């Protein structure tokens, strides 16, 4: 009755190994407050957004659309480079996304009303890759993986980007150390302000 | 322009207020030698009212004759960071507190004890609550047509006048 | 049951001798993956345009079509593409093979409906395929030989690439 | 009682519409599962879809590459915008709306193609690596791996 | 052959220093005791004797590959475009310049990608009843109860053996500065 | 935590002088790293 992840706690009750992923790692307890079906949904919403924006970073630095606009190989300045039009048109893109796919049962209180709906499972299958039963268990599995993976990987370049201001490959290839006179980290109040 | 108003780039005295403003800094900063964090802090306040200023003259407000800008809230489009922006903004975020919390309140009526979840709050119901509040037009509006937002004046204690 | 062409690996469960060319060989899957219908029509049709492709790299080093010389001089292989995309040469070819794709959109949704078999457009306008046993034997040998200029046609353009030649004279000179 | 975040209305005492259809399997290519009307998906399903896709795929030939052709005393073709031919009965609009207006590509400088990038407004395909190695580089060029070098011997 | 009792086996301790485990089990080939951390309690035994000897032929392989390349024996017209040295580092070094390393990472990556992983995936999971490291490969006979046996176990020492002999020539040759033979 | 302790945190002081300590925390941060803002900017 301990955890696997950590040993010398007690497993969280609504972790029963039943999910995908499920290596009984809640050290906080926060699906004991927060109902596991929400944490799910918000899991793999974050891992999906991430796996592309980490794809994304990469992509973007090596192979772009045409034009001025879009030669911005450091993501960092892609975002204040790209056409602001566009990019609200990709927010409000979204947002009819998030109301459609969710179909408006999208806030804490509403969503899951229908006893037929699952955490993460939208219904997006538009290849019918999904449609064998046997792969099921792996594919659940490695999609939370990867959404994991990537979590941590993407929150790695934009800091490393924000550290070296370089494109993520780029920075691998062209390495400059962290001379420690810049970049220096708190101390708002050490020097009384300013 | 609006109102026989100055743009704040061009007034004159919004410039004389900078140049006032900056000289008063600098008498004080006269009194202390380069290094010390007296010396550095008045040049970071110098720095600071400086780029207040820039920021305001490149903003499209409009300075009256005493030099400080004020504000056009007639409606027109040219002036809506000014009011209709920043309303639309807090009209948001009120109609946000409003509707969450008169979900928590309808929730605790439903309670073991009603009194007991108002100065003991439940926080993961609560939290459920304020996360539902962005979507709080549609999901009010919603309210109403369905009539569960309006009670109906006969449900409502009254006065005998 | 254990795969004939990869024998440490099992047998690909979604795989069977009544396909064409079938040897046992999904050793990463794919075919659990993808629906089998829609891999095999992909299969055929990457093997027939690249039949096409390897025989034209070819002809294309042996002879040219009167006048092409001219308007194309030394670029062979992609080179010509992007002096054949100005002129209007390209861009006729795409719109005629993207109308032929077009019905075979509708072909390749009635295969996965299960209504047509994988690369069947019923095309045998001389006749080849009257008797079974040589129908099944060209079924088999043209699975062969598209597979087989799929390769070709790779290692063909990336000779290209690396020497600006191409298949016929890079035997000749190298 | 309510965990949080539970998300059944009945558990935060909010009106629910109390009717939950029955979710369905079926798919469809650029569409998403779920209840629909009976005969939708048999009508609107992946057959549609993709002959629709298809449709629209190979009518963008024509489209991404709309203008008058004309030729000169050779065969050399000049192609112009479509606003140029003036329709002859409508008063005082003398140049009409065309297909130039719905797919306005010459204005943003597009050059569409029927592949949709054309020469100019090609992809940019670029080379991060630059030229050089993962380990053992000289010169203006120095990976993460050689820094991992440079620190083991020092 | 197996040898039960006197080598290899089960109860067959080789350092009686350190008790034999109830952890380990007396049925992989070349098992003799030996596991003083207490490894196979936890993991996976398969997993881990295929990785041994994976590991063994790698170590076997690059036995083969350091005493040719440092006896000075070489294919023909490998020295003109390589280096003619032969401390291995350097040679390991100018080929990867010349890309011959990169085509034997390449195809290496490329048995691993689709059949390693699924070799492993298969072996693991318990679908497909494959001994640790098999891949059919026996081409020139020798076969049946010695490949079983005997075969079996000298692969598996051998390749410690490899392994341990080829950890040592490295570190030997880095501090030397000198290559064996 | 005890379920004593954390009942006393979601009393109405608590709750109410964390939410607004939290509350004024971010303005007091927003106008820190973007003061002066007056307008909309726009
Ligand atoms: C209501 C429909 C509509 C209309 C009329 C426009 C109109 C415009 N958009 Mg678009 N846009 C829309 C919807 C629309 N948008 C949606 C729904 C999104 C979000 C996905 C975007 C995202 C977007 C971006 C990011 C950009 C535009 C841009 C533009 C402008 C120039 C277009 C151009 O030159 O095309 C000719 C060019 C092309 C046809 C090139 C196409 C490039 C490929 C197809 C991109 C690949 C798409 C990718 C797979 C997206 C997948 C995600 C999606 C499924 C959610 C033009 C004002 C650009 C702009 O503002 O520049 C000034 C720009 O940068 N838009
Ligand atoms: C969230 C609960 C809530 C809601 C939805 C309303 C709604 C309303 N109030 Mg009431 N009110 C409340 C709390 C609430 N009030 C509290 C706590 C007090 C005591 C200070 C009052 C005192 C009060 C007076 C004296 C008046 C109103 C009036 C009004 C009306 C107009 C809006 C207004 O004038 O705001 C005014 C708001 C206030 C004066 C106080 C609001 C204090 C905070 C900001 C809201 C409460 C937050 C609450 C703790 C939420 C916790 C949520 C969490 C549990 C999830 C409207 C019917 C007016 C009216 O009748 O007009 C027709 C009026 O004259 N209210
Ligand atoms: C993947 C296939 C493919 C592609 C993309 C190209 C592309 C091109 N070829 Mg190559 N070519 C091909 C196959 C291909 N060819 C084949 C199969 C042959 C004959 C063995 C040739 C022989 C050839 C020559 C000799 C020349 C080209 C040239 C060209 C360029 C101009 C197009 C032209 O006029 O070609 C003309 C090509 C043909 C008329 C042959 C078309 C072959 C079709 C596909 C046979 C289909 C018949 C079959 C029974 C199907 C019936 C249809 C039915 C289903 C309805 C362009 C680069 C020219 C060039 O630029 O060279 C520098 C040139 O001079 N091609
Ligand atoms: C896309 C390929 C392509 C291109 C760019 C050309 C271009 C040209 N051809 Mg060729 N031609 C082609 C395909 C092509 N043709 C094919 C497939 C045939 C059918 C066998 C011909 C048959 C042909 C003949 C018979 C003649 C030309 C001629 C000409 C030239 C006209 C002057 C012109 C430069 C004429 C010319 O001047 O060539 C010497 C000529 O006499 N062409
Ligand atoms: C002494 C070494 C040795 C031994 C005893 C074995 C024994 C075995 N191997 Mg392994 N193997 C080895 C080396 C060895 N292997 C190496 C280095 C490789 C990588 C190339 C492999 C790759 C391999 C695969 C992929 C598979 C096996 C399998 C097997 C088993 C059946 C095959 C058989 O019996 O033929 C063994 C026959 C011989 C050992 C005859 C001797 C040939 C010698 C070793 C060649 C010497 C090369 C060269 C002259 C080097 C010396 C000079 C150098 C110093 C410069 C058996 C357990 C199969 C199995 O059942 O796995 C569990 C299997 O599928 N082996
Ligand atoms: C070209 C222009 C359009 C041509 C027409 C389109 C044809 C489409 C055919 C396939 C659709 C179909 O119905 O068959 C789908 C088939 C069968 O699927 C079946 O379709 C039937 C249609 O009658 C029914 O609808 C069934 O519900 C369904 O089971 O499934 C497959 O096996 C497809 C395998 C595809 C391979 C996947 C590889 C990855 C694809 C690219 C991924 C890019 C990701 C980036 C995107 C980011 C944003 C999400
Ligand atoms: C149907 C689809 C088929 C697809 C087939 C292709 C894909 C198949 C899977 C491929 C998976 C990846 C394989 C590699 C592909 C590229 C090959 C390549 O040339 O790479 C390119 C690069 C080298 O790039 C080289 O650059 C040189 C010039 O500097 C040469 O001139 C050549 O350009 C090139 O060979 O490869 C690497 O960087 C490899 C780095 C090391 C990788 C591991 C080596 C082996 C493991 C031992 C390492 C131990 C380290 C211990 C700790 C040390 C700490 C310092
Ligand atoms: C699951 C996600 C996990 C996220 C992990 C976070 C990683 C980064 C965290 C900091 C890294 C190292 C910090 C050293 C940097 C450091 O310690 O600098 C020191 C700084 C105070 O300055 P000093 O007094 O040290 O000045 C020292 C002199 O040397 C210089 O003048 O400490 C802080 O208060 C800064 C943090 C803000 C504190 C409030 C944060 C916002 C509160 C929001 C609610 C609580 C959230 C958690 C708060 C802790
Ligand atoms: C002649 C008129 C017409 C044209 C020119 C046309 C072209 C395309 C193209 C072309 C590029 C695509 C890609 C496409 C795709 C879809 N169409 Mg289709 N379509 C047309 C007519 C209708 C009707 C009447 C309906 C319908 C539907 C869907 C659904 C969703 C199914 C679902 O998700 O369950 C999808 C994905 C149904 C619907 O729900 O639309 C919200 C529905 O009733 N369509 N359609
Ligand atoms: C909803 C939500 C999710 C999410 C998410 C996220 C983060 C989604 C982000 C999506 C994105 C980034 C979409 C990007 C679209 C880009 C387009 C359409 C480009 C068009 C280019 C054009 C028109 C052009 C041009 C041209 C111009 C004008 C002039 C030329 O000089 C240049 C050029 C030729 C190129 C997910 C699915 C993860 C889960 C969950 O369900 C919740
Ligand atoms: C599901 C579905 C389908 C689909 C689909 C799609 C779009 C699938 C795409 C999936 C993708 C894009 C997965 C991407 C994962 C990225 C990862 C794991 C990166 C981790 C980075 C790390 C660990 C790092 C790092 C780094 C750091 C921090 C330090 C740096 O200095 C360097 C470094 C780079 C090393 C389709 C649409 C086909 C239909 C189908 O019917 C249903």
């Known amino acids: 009755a301990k955890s696997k992840a950590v040993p010398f706690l007690s497993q969280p009750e609504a972790l029963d190994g039943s999910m995908a992923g499920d290596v009984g790692f809640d050290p906080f307890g926060i699906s004991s407050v927060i109902d596991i079906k929400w944490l799910r949904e918000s899991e793999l919403k974050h891992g999906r957004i991430c796996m592309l924006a980490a794809t994304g970073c990469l992509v973007q630095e090596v192979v772009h659309l045409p034009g001025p606009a879009f030669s911005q190989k450091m993501a960092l300045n892609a975002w204040a480079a790209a056409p602001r039009g566009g990019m609200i048109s990709i927010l409000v893109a979204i947002g009819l996304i998030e109301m459609i796919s969710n179909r408006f049962a999208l806030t804490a209180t509403d969503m899951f009303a229908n006893p037929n709906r699952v955490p993460g499972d939208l219904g997006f299958d538009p290849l019918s890759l999904g449609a064998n039963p046997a792969n099921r268990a792996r594919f659940e599995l490695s999609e939370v993986i990867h959404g994991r993976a990537a979590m941590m990987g993407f929150s790695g370049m934009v800091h490393q980007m924000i550290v070296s201001k370089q494109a993520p490959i780029e920075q691998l290839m062209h390495f400059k150390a962290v001379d420690s006179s810049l970049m220096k980290l708190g101390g708002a109040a050490g020097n009384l302000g300013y | 322009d609006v109102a026989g108003l100055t743009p704040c780039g061009e007034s004159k005295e919004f410039a004389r207020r900078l140049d006032g403003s900056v000289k008063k800094l600098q008498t004080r900063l006269s009194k202390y030698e380069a290094g010390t964090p007296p010396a550095l802090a008045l040049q970071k306040q110098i720095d600071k009212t400086k780029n207040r200023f820039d920021r305001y003259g490149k903003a499209g407000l409009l300075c009256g004759t005493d030099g400080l800008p004020h504000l056009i809230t007639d409606g027109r489009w040219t002036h809506s960071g000014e009011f209709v922006i920043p309303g639309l903004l807090f009209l948001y975020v009120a109609g946000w507190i409003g509707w969450v919390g008169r979900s928590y309140v309808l929730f605790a009526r439903t309670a073991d004890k009603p009194t007991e979840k108002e100065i003991i709050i439940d926080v993961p119901v609560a939290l459920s609550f304020v996360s539902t509040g962005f979507i709080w037009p549609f999901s009010a509006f919603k309210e109403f047509t369905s009539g569960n937002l309006i009670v109906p004046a006969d449900e409502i204690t009254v006065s005998p006048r | 049951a254990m795969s004939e062409s990869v024998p440490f690996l099992k047998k690909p469960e979604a795989l069977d001798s009544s396909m064409a060319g079938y040897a046992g060989f999904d050793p990463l899957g794919l075919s659990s993956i993808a629906d089998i219908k829609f891999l095999q029509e992909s299969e055929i049709k990457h093997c027939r345009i690249a039949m096409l492709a390897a025989a034209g790299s070819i002809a294309q080093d042996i002879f040219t079509f009167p006048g092409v010389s001219k308007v194309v001089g030394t670029a062979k292989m992609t080179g010509v593409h992007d002096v054949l995309v100005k002129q209007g040469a390209m861009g006729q070819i795409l719109l005629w093979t993207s109308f032929l794709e077009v019905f075979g959109t509708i072909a390749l949704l009635e295969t996965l409906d299960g209504k047509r078999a994988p690369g069947d457009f019923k095309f045998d306008p001389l006749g080849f395929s009257k008797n079974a046993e040589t129908a099944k034997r060209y079924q088999l040998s043209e699975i062969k030989n598209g597979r087989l200029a799929m390769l070709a046609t790779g290692g063909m353009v990336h000779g290209y690439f690396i020497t600006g030649k191409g298949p016929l004279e890079l035997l000749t000179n190298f | 009682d309510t965990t949080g975040f539970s998300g059944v209305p009945s558990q935060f005492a909010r009106p629910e519409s109390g009717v939950y259809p029955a979710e369905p399997t079926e798919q469809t290519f650029l569409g998403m599962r779920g209840p629909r009307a009976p005969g939708h998906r048999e009508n609107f399903g992946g057959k549609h879809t993709a002959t629709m896709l298809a449709i629209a795929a190979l009518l963008w030939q024509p489209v991404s590459e709309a203008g008058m052709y004309r030729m000169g005393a050779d065969g050399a073709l000049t192609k112009s915008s479509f606003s140029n031919m003036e329709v002859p009965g409508f008063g005082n609009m003398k140049k009409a709306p065309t297909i130039e207006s719905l797919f306005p590509f010459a204005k943003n400088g597009f050059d569409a193609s029927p592949a949709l990038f054309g020469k100019g407004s090609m992809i940019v395909v670029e080379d991060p690596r630059d030229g050089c190695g993962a380990y053992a580089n000289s010169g203006a060029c120095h990976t993460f791996l050689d820094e991992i070098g440079d620190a083991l011997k020092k | ?181 | 935590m005890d379920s004593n302790f954390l009942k006393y945190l979601s009393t109405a002081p608590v709750l109410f002088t964390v939410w607004l300590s939290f509350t004024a925390s971010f303005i007091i941060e927003a106008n820190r790293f973007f003061p002066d803002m007056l307008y909309f900017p726009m």
């Open chain 5, 1 to 181: 052959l197996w040898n039960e009792g006197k080598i290899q086996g089960k109860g067959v301790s080789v350092i009686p220093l350190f008790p034999r485990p109830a952890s380990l089990d007396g049925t992989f080939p070349g098992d003799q005791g030996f596991d003083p951390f207490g490894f196979s309690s936890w993991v996976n035994m398969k997993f881990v004797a295929e990785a041994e000897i994976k590991h063994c032929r790698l170590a076997m392989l690059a036995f083969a590959g350091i005493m040719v390349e440092s006896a000075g024996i070489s294919f023909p017209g490998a020295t003109s475009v390589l280096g003619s040295s032969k401390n291995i580092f350097e040679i390991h070094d100018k080929a990867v310049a010349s890309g011959a390393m990169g085509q034997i990472l390449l195809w290496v990556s490329f048995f691993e990608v689709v059949a390693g992983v699924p070799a492993m995936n298969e072996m693991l999971n318990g679908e497909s009843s494959r001994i640790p490291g098999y891949y059919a490969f026996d081409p020139l006979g020798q076969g049946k109860g010695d490949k079983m046996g005997r075969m079996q176990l000298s692969e598996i020492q051998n390749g410690r053996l490899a392994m341990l002999a080829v950890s040592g020539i490295v570190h030997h040759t880095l501090i030397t500065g000198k290559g064996p033979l």
